[PDB]
């Protein structure tokens, strides 16, 4: 082109030097810790609700003698500066002041707690502070003030525990909110956005509910430990039609041994209840299968499929296509 070769040969040297000045050699330990103390603490104290205390274990008598119920309230998270008390005087607290003195560099947090029993600004704890951070004292300083207790070859990214300096290694884990295809067996998992809303569609043999001869590949889904058939979950909501339930599973492939497994999957679901009988007939089986566990959720099964099944797409008929 019209651009010279010697210009583009020297443009990368100016691009990388500008990259190493802005992001620096540590762009993962600080940009993920400044996000934690500014937004992570504002949801770990808010996504837990309240607490309920009621020691009436014989007969409920809340209205009779005004039994006090204990409730709490959280909010207004604020992080204080690292400060230590010395002869009734508040001074600064530098990392080299905590390294030599064999102390832990930390800062306390405080929320607003309000209780009501009839019918503030307490402390919770102290988290360790990473040096050269948004809340650390070695930030937006001058070149003459930093020459007191800081080295030129030292940078942030390490915590100051009382024993020694401890760092963090990037722990690699699996990808969430993605379809996980496994092998032996053929499970398609679905990771959780809430605490536990996993969805494991399994294609395996039907050892249960068999007459000791028909043992072929069937479609079973593991939703909240129910082992319900997939085809009855199809008629539980949305489509209400067997011929109109193949366009959601339309792939235009060769029919060799998968159509037989679909025939087995509809014949297993036809053998326990009546799928296409009525609207409130297929929901009765999942309503009695949710309650038939050791730890049941809230019994409103018409609304239980909104906050526990697919934390996502809000429409009930739109959940069948996924």
């Amino acid at each position: 082109s019209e651009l010279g070769e010697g210009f583009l040969q020297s443009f990368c040297k100016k691009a990388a030097t500008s990259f190493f000045d802005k992001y620096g050699l540590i762009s993962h330990q600080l940009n993920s810790y400044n996000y934690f103390i500014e937004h992570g603490l504002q949801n770990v104290f808010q996504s837990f609700g309240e607490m309920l205390v009621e020691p009436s274990f014989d007969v409920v008598k809340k209205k009779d003698n005004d039994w006090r119920y204990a409730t709490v309230k959280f909010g207004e998270v604020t992080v204080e500066k690292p400060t230590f008390f010395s002869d009734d005087k508040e001074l600064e607290f530098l990392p080299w002041h905590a390294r030599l003195q064999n102390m832990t560099y930390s800062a306390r947090i405080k929320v607003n707690v309000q209780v009501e029993v009839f019918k503030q600004d307490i402390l919770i704890g102290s988290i360790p502070v990473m040096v050269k951070s948004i809340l650390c004292k070695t930030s937006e300083k001058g070149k003459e003030n930093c020459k007191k207790g800081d080295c030129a070859f030292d940078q942030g990214g390490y915590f100051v525990i009382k024993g020694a300096e401890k760092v963090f290694i990037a722990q690699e884990q699996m990808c969430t909110k993605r379809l996980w295809i496994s092998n032996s067996p053929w499970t398609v998992s679905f990771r959780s956005e809430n605490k536990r809303n996993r969805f494991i569609v399994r294609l395996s043999e039907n050892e249960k509910a068999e007459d000791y001869k028909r043992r072929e590949k069937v479609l079973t889904v593991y939703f909240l430990s129910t082992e319900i058939p997939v085809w009855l979950l199809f008629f539980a909501l949305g489509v209400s039609s067997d011929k109109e339930a193949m366009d959601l599973i339309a792939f235009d492939g060769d029919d060799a041994s998968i159509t037989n497994s679909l025939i087995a999957s509809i014949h297993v679901a036809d053998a326990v209840c009546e799928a296409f009988r009525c609207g409130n007939n297929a929901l009765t089986y999942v309503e009695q299968q949710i309650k038939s566990t050791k730890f049941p959720p809230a019994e409103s099964v018409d609304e239980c499929l909104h906050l526990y099944l697919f934390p996502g797409l809000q429409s009930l008929k739109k959940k069948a296509r996924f």
Binding site: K14, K22, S27, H28, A170, K177, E244, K318
Partner: protein
């Protein structure tokens, strides 16, 4: 790597981690170190859902009939949002609007014709690297990184975005 073939390298991390730096002994292959041009992503505070409907994407139906007549499904962060018309103009319009400092620059958008999908990831955990673009290269110690990022002569190509673009090794030779 808290744990097969994990001790052997993979062509996915081309420039992300080092395939030559590995501590020998018991941790040969599990403890890998990042490269020089390596930065992790951060979860975006703004909602990118409302900004996709004004770029050639329509909302999918909910009346459980009239299926897609060869329409690709868009995957916004693992969840469905709607259906697109074509996966050639829409993905290019989003990639041209990301360079104009409107969409968040830590977005890894990937198209594919095999799985018949469009994947858009905005979560935190992915690691990126900077790659210079050729189409905006005609815009010529006066080069800060924000001026390179905002005008669109430099972008952060993600991990899935590196599988549908040919990157020349020589910057001024190849």
């Amino acid at each position: 790597q808290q744990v097969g073939d994990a001790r052997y390298p993979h062509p996915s991390h081309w420039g992300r981690v080092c395939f030559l730096s590995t501590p020998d002994g018991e941790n040969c292959g599990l403890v890998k170190n990042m490269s020089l041009l390596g930065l992790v992503s951060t979860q975006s505070l703004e909602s990118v859902v409302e900004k996709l409907f004004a770029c050639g994407m329509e909302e999918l139906m909910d009346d459980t009939c009239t299926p897609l007549f060869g329409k690709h499904k868009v995957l916004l962060n693992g969840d469905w949002v709607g259906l697109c018309a074509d996966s050639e103009s829409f993905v290019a319009e989003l990639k041209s609007r990301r360079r104009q400092s409107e969409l968040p620059r830590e977005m890894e958008i990937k198209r594919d014709k095999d799985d018949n999908e469009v994947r858009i990831f905005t979560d935190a955990g992915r690691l990126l690297r900077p790659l210079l673009v050729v189409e905006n290269l005609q815009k010529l110690s006066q080069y800060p990184f924000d001026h390179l990022l905002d005008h669109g002569i430099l972008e952060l190509i993600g991990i899935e975005e590196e599988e549908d673009c040919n990157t020349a090794w020589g910057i001024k030779q190849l």
